[PDB]
mmCIF file of C-alpha atoms and ligand atoms in Angstrom:
data_model
loop_
_atom_site.group_PDB
_atom_site.id
_atom_site.type_symbol
_atom_site.label_atom_id
_atom_site.label_comp_id
_atom_site.label_asym_id
_atom_site.label_seq_id
_atom_site.Cartn_x
_atom_site.Cartn_y
_atom_site.Cartn_z
ATOM 1 C CA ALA A 18 85.863 60.767 116.480
ATOM 2 C CA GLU A 19 89.464 62.550 115.703
ATOM 3 C CA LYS A 20 92.575 61.890 114.165
ATOM 4 C CA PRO A 21 96.046 60.711 115.619
ATOM 5 C CA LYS A 22 98.780 63.320 116.560
ATOM 6 C CA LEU A 23 102.341 63.313 115.684
ATOM 7 C CA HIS A 24 105.262 65.343 117.723
ATOM 8 C CA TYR A 25 108.429 65.642 116.762
ATOM 9 C CA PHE A 26 110.039 67.696 114.639
ATOM 10 C CA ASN A 27 110.343 68.140 110.641
ATOM 11 C CA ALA A 28 112.660 65.469 110.123
ATOM 12 C CA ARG A 29 112.535 61.653 109.452
ATOM 13 C CA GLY A 30 114.416 60.888 112.189
ATOM 14 C CA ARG A 31 112.795 58.596 114.493
ATOM 15 C CA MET A 32 109.032 59.053 113.898
ATOM 16 C CA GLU A 33 109.098 58.071 110.011
ATOM 17 C CA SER A 34 108.677 54.648 110.356
ATOM 18 C CA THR A 35 104.665 55.649 112.229
ATOM 19 C CA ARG A 36 104.371 58.225 109.680
ATOM 20 C CA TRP A 37 104.827 54.765 106.633
ATOM 21 C CA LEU A 38 102.737 52.935 108.832
ATOM 22 C CA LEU A 39 99.609 54.994 109.490
ATOM 23 C CA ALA A 40 99.892 55.019 106.238
ATOM 24 C CA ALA A 41 100.199 52.172 105.075
ATOM 25 C CA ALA A 42 97.155 51.531 107.187
ATOM 26 C CA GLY A 43 94.798 54.149 105.221
ATOM 27 C CA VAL A 44 94.719 55.847 108.653
ATOM 28 C CA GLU A 45 94.740 60.064 108.325
ATOM 29 C CA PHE A 46 96.696 61.448 111.139
ATOM 30 C CA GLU A 47 98.357 65.155 111.585
ATOM 31 C CA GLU A 48 101.054 66.429 112.693
ATOM 32 C CA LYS A 49 102.387 69.440 114.872
ATOM 33 C CA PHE A 50 106.062 69.998 114.412
ATOM 34 C CA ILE A 51 108.593 71.429 117.164
ATOM 35 C CA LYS A 52 110.486 74.393 116.244
ATOM 36 C CA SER A 53 112.661 75.892 118.650
ATOM 37 C CA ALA A 54 113.392 74.200 122.138
ATOM 38 C CA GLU A 55 110.960 76.023 123.096
ATOM 39 C CA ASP A 56 108.564 74.412 122.078
ATOM 40 C CA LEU A 57 109.689 70.772 123.198
ATOM 41 C CA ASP A 58 109.603 72.627 125.961
ATOM 42 C CA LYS A 59 106.138 73.552 126.497
ATOM 43 C CA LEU A 60 105.691 70.227 125.805
ATOM 44 C CA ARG A 61 107.704 68.829 128.912
ATOM 45 C CA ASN A 62 106.526 71.714 131.484
ATOM 46 C CA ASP A 63 102.715 70.808 130.241
ATOM 47 C CA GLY A 64 102.975 66.827 131.365
ATOM 48 C CA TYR A 65 102.913 65.196 127.665
ATOM 49 C CA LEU A 66 106.277 63.873 127.883
ATOM 50 C CA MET A 67 106.377 60.872 129.999
ATOM 51 C CA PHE A 68 110.546 60.607 129.549
ATOM 52 C CA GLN A 69 110.991 64.115 129.032
ATOM 53 C CA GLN A 70 110.942 63.086 125.191
ATOM 54 C CA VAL A 71 109.487 63.055 121.587
ATOM 55 C CA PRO A 72 108.158 60.929 119.237
ATOM 56 C CA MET A 73 104.760 61.034 120.895
ATOM 57 C CA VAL A 74 101.339 59.821 119.775
ATOM 58 C CA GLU A 75 97.710 61.240 120.954
ATOM 59 C CA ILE A 76 95.884 58.417 119.195
ATOM 60 C CA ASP A 77 92.751 57.305 121.493
ATOM 61 C CA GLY A 78 93.124 58.877 124.170
ATOM 62 C CA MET A 79 96.493 58.624 125.181
ATOM 63 C CA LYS A 80 100.164 59.811 124.857
ATOM 64 C CA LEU A 81 102.308 57.285 123.797
ATOM 65 C CA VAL A 82 105.919 58.162 123.576
ATOM 66 C CA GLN A 83 108.275 55.419 122.551
ATOM 67 C CA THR A 84 108.839 54.212 119.431
ATOM 68 C CA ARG A 85 107.955 50.904 119.874
ATOM 69 C CA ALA A 86 104.638 51.199 122.488
ATOM 70 C CA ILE A 87 103.269 53.164 119.568
ATOM 71 C CA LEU A 88 104.019 51.395 116.678
ATOM 72 C CA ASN A 89 103.097 48.898 118.167
ATOM 73 C CA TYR A 90 99.756 49.886 119.268
ATOM 74 C CA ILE A 91 99.005 50.882 115.661
ATOM 75 C CA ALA A 92 99.666 48.235 114.088
ATOM 76 C CA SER A 93 97.656 45.557 116.475
ATOM 77 C CA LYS A 94 94.555 48.336 116.190
ATOM 78 C CA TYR A 95 94.932 47.608 111.857
ATOM 79 C CA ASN A 96 96.030 44.434 111.923
ATOM 80 C CA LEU A 97 99.343 44.756 110.922
ATOM 81 C CA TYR A 98 100.514 42.682 113.755
ATOM 82 C CA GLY A 99 99.303 38.986 112.686
ATOM 83 C CA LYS A 100 96.824 36.646 113.940
ATOM 84 C CA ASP A 101 98.164 34.684 116.729
ATOM 85 C CA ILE A 102 101.595 35.538 119.112
ATOM 86 C CA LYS A 103 103.242 32.681 116.855
ATOM 87 C CA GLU A 104 102.506 35.328 113.831
ATOM 88 C CA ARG A 105 104.190 37.845 116.490
ATOM 89 C CA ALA A 106 106.934 35.942 117.308
ATOM 90 C CA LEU A 107 108.364 35.874 113.526
ATOM 91 C CA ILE A 108 106.935 39.574 113.091
ATOM 92 C CA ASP A 109 108.987 40.662 116.164
ATOM 93 C CA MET A 110 112.244 39.233 115.508
ATOM 94 C CA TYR A 111 111.912 40.221 111.230
ATOM 95 C CA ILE A 112 111.440 44.476 112.597
ATOM 96 C CA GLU A 113 114.107 43.969 115.460
ATOM 97 C CA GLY A 114 116.354 43.472 113.080
ATOM 98 C CA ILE A 115 115.029 45.820 110.403
ATOM 99 C CA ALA A 116 115.495 48.524 113.317
ATOM 100 C CA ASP A 117 118.924 47.369 114.417
ATOM 101 C CA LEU A 118 120.061 48.469 110.958
ATOM 102 C CA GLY A 119 117.626 51.253 110.376
ATOM 103 C CA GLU A 120 118.911 52.513 113.589
ATOM 104 C CA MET A 121 122.555 52.267 112.550
ATOM 105 C CA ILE A 122 121.106 54.164 109.385
ATOM 106 C CA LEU A 123 119.821 56.976 111.531
ATOM 107 C CA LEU A 124 122.517 57.321 113.662
ATOM 108 C CA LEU A 125 124.687 58.670 111.064
ATOM 109 C CA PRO A 126 124.407 61.761 110.828
ATOM 110 C CA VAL A 127 126.140 61.573 114.484
ATOM 111 C CA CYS A 128 128.854 59.785 113.822
ATOM 112 C CA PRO A 129 132.810 61.759 114.504
ATOM 113 C CA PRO A 130 133.733 62.645 111.336
ATOM 114 C CA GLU A 131 136.805 60.288 111.796
ATOM 115 C CA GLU A 132 135.232 57.066 112.447
ATOM 116 C CA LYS A 133 132.644 57.902 109.332
ATOM 117 C CA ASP A 134 134.040 56.099 106.956
ATOM 118 C CA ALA A 135 134.519 52.864 108.626
ATOM 119 C CA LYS A 136 130.927 53.193 109.695
ATOM 120 C CA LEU A 137 129.754 53.188 106.605
ATOM 121 C CA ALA A 138 131.426 50.624 105.200
ATOM 122 C CA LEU A 139 130.770 48.250 107.999
ATOM 123 C CA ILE A 140 126.969 49.147 107.413
ATOM 124 C CA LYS A 141 127.080 48.511 103.622
ATOM 125 C CA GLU A 142 128.649 44.956 104.889
ATOM 126 C CA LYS A 143 126.351 43.634 107.153
ATOM 127 C CA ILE A 144 123.682 44.617 104.866
ATOM 128 C CA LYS A 145 125.153 42.108 102.434
ATOM 129 C CA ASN A 146 126.084 39.843 103.823
ATOM 130 C CA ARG A 147 123.865 39.234 107.225
ATOM 131 C CA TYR A 148 120.750 41.539 107.267
ATOM 132 C CA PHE A 149 119.433 41.232 103.147
ATOM 133 C CA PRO A 150 120.178 37.196 103.211
ATOM 134 C CA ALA A 151 118.451 36.528 105.972
ATOM 135 C CA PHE A 152 115.272 38.586 104.963
ATOM 136 C CA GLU A 153 115.938 36.486 100.949
ATOM 137 C CA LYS A 154 115.473 33.693 102.629
ATOM 138 C CA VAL A 155 112.746 34.272 104.067
ATOM 139 C CA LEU A 156 111.334 35.062 101.210
ATOM 140 C CA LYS A 157 112.812 32.081 99.512
ATOM 141 C CA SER A 158 111.499 29.645 102.173
ATOM 142 C CA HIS A 159 107.174 30.197 101.805
ATOM 143 C CA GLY A 160 107.958 31.393 98.372
ATOM 144 C CA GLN A 161 104.525 33.894 99.040
ATOM 145 C CA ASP A 162 104.300 38.264 98.816
ATOM 146 C CA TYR A 163 104.619 39.157 102.257
ATOM 147 C CA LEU A 164 107.249 37.697 104.979
ATOM 148 C CA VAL A 165 104.420 36.552 107.721
ATOM 149 C CA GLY A 166 101.117 34.539 106.811
ATOM 150 C CA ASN A 167 100.301 35.207 103.184
ATOM 151 C CA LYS A 168 99.128 38.747 104.372
ATOM 152 C CA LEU A 169 99.810 42.395 104.286
ATOM 153 C CA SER A 170 101.672 42.685 108.134
ATOM 154 C CA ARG A 171 104.006 45.729 110.073
ATOM 155 C CA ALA A 172 107.030 44.048 108.890
ATOM 156 C CA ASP A 173 106.156 44.718 104.544
ATOM 157 C CA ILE A 174 106.087 48.110 105.417
ATOM 158 C CA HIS A 175 109.303 48.069 107.654
ATOM 159 C CA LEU A 176 111.035 46.264 105.255
ATOM 160 C CA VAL A 177 110.324 48.674 102.540
ATOM 161 C CA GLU A 178 110.532 51.483 104.647
ATOM 162 C CA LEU A 179 114.312 50.097 105.375
ATOM 163 C CA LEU A 180 115.230 48.699 101.532
ATOM 164 C CA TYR A 181 114.010 52.651 99.876
ATOM 165 C CA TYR A 182 117.258 54.780 103.355
ATOM 166 C CA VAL A 183 119.693 51.562 101.283
ATOM 167 C CA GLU A 184 119.158 53.058 98.507
ATOM 168 C CA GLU A 185 120.354 55.849 99.384
ATOM 169 C CA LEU A 186 123.618 54.965 100.483
ATOM 170 C CA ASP A 187 123.853 52.766 97.752
ATOM 171 C CA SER A 188 121.611 51.085 94.980
ATOM 172 C CA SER A 189 123.976 48.193 94.725
ATOM 173 C CA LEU A 190 123.180 46.543 97.448
ATOM 174 C CA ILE A 191 120.037 45.338 96.538
ATOM 175 C CA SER A 192 120.989 43.808 93.532
ATOM 176 C CA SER A 193 121.676 40.362 94.472
ATOM 177 C CA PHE A 194 118.402 39.976 96.390
ATOM 178 C CA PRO A 195 115.439 39.770 93.774
ATOM 179 C CA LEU A 196 113.030 38.638 95.488
ATOM 180 C CA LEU A 197 113.582 41.651 97.889
ATOM 181 C CA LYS A 198 113.306 44.179 95.117
ATOM 182 C CA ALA A 199 110.159 42.343 93.851
ATOM 183 C CA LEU A 200 108.712 43.034 97.295
ATOM 184 C CA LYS A 201 110.051 46.933 96.983
ATOM 185 C CA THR A 202 107.533 47.168 93.735
ATOM 186 C CA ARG A 203 104.843 44.817 95.500
ATOM 187 C CA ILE A 204 104.588 46.961 98.373
ATOM 188 C CA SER A 205 105.563 49.833 96.631
ATOM 189 C CA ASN A 206 101.866 49.481 94.079
ATOM 190 C CA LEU A 207 99.392 48.970 97.097
ATOM 191 C CA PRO A 208 96.849 52.606 96.421
ATOM 192 C CA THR A 209 98.272 54.069 99.880
ATOM 193 C CA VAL A 210 101.624 52.962 100.010
ATOM 194 C CA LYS A 211 101.522 54.285 95.726
ATOM 195 C CA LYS A 212 99.941 57.787 97.341
ATOM 196 C CA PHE A 213 102.148 58.323 100.431
ATOM 197 C CA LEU A 214 105.597 57.943 97.558
ATOM 198 C CA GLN A 215 103.779 60.549 95.766
ATOM 199 C CA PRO A 216 104.663 64.193 96.024
ATOM 200 C CA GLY A 217 102.786 66.408 98.546
ATOM 201 C CA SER A 218 102.380 63.263 101.593
ATOM 202 C CA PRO A 219 103.718 63.348 105.197
ATOM 203 C CA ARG A 220 106.589 61.699 103.844
ATOM 204 C CA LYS A 221 109.909 63.492 104.452
ATOM 205 C CA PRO A 222 112.823 63.779 103.200
ATOM 206 C CA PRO A 223 116.625 62.666 104.568
ATOM 207 C CA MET A 224 117.846 64.035 107.154
ATOM 208 C CA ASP A 225 120.282 67.730 105.311
ATOM 209 C CA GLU A 226 122.878 70.026 106.894
ATOM 210 C CA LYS A 227 119.833 72.901 108.076
ATOM 211 C CA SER A 228 117.797 69.787 108.896
ATOM 212 C CA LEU A 229 120.755 68.674 111.428
ATOM 213 C CA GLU A 230 121.475 72.456 113.203
ATOM 214 C CA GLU A 231 117.693 72.047 113.649
ATOM 215 C CA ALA A 232 117.759 69.351 115.917
ATOM 216 C CA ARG A 233 120.679 70.251 117.900
ATOM 217 C CA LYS A 234 119.510 73.340 119.091
ATOM 218 C CA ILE A 235 115.967 71.846 119.382
ATOM 219 C CA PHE A 236 117.380 68.908 121.577
ATOM 220 C CA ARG A 237 120.654 70.810 122.780
ATOM 221 C CA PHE A 238 122.967 68.404 121.286
HETATM 222 N N1 GSN B 441 113.908 55.214 122.879
HETATM 223 C C1 GSN B 441 113.747 56.563 122.211
HETATM 224 C C2 GSN B 441 114.236 57.713 122.399
HETATM 225 C C3 GSN B 441 113.290 59.005 122.010
HETATM 226 C C4 GSN B 441 114.852 60.009 121.634
HETATM 227 O O1 GSN B 441 115.975 60.091 122.666
HETATM 228 N N2 GSN B 441 114.109 61.093 121.056
HETATM 229 C C5 GSN B 441 114.901 62.191 121.668
HETATM 230 C C6 GSN B 441 114.893 63.118 120.288
HETATM 231 S S1 GSN B 441 115.020 61.793 118.753
HETATM 232 N N3 GSN B 441 116.096 61.308 117.946
HETATM 233 O O2 GSN B 441 116.892 60.512 118.194
HETATM 234 C C7 GSN B 441 114.661 63.217 122.135
HETATM 235 O O3 GSN B 441 113.601 64.105 122.703
HETATM 236 N N4 GSN B 441 115.607 63.832 123.354
HETATM 237 C C8 GSN B 441 115.604 64.856 124.032
HETATM 238 C C9 GSN B 441 116.513 64.273 125.867
HETATM 239 O O4 GSN B 441 116.662 63.444 125.438
HETATM 240 O O5 GSN B 441 116.104 65.102 126.881
HETATM 241 C C10 GSN B 441 112.261 56.386 121.618
HETATM 242 O O6 GSN B 441 111.147 56.563 121.316
HETATM 243 O O7 GSN B 441 112.654 55.273 120.865
#
């Protein structure tokens, strides 16, 4: 057999949620880091990127691009996408809300400076008034340890990943949400996730100015 190969640059960006999901599932993977525009052009010219973009993951004979296509395949393959169509609908609704908030946070480094204060404030307001109340309500509704089906799913993984990013922005935002705090602790203690959180794993740090400059050179923006 062959390990999945993750093509991206050496940063969180749009590949980090896949790193989290594979690690949580206990699946070993390799990474091939793009370090220059030439490296990206070589993937393009070799025919490996359907829309000439990364993330790309080589898995099970496919060269899959598009974050959501990659994640959906991995979640189904490793039994992290619920047990039927209705559970998948709940999972999809939850994770698309997570993705909407995650996208706002992802794009902060490219926000025009004159708009950044207001953008950050609006994100914090949405966390406190829209997203954290919605997920706290799910957990309170059923009283169970996981978001869907009383069993670990991708929704728990994606949410807990997001909770780490929210903590980096403002550690007080989760303070009024005890069920979210408890979920963060439980998921972080699962053996595979605990290992991924320790040093030396593929988990990536927050993007710094040097990494942003590298992204500008690689992706030509
Ligand atoms: N919807 C796609 C977006 C992929 C994408 O935008 N990739 C960028 C780098 S990731 N940070 O956004 C990319 O390859 N840019 C090069 C280009 O579009 O020419 C996805 O995979 O999620």
